[PDB]
């Protein structure tokens, strides 16, 4: 299902996290945000994973 964009204004978040497997050729530093029905991982560039 599609990521229900956070209409809730709080949304816990964590920062500084290397992801495995690598989205690109090498690891990508990013942050994580807990959404209403899932997590969204956003790299420093802008790669969004749900």
């Amino acid at each position: 299902d599609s990521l229900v964009i956070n209409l809730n204004r709080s949304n816990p978040k964590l920062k500084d996290l290397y992801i495995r497997p690598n989205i690109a050729q090498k690891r990508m530093q990013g942050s994580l945000e807990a959404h209403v029905n899932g997590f969204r991982f956003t790299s420093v560039r802008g790669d969004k994973v749900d």
Binding site: R9, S10, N11, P12, K13, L14
Partner: protein, 52 residues
Amino acid sequence: PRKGTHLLKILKQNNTRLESRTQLVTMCHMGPKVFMNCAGFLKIDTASLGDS
């Protein structure tokens, strides 16, 4: 201005955002009257706050 600067300096030294108005009394040690006066005029955007 004197109290505003003092409050901002305390916040910078703590290196933490004003998560709640109760912080003004706990960590900032603001007086009861000063708190009663300046409580309903300090917005704490919980939307942009995110994590505590």
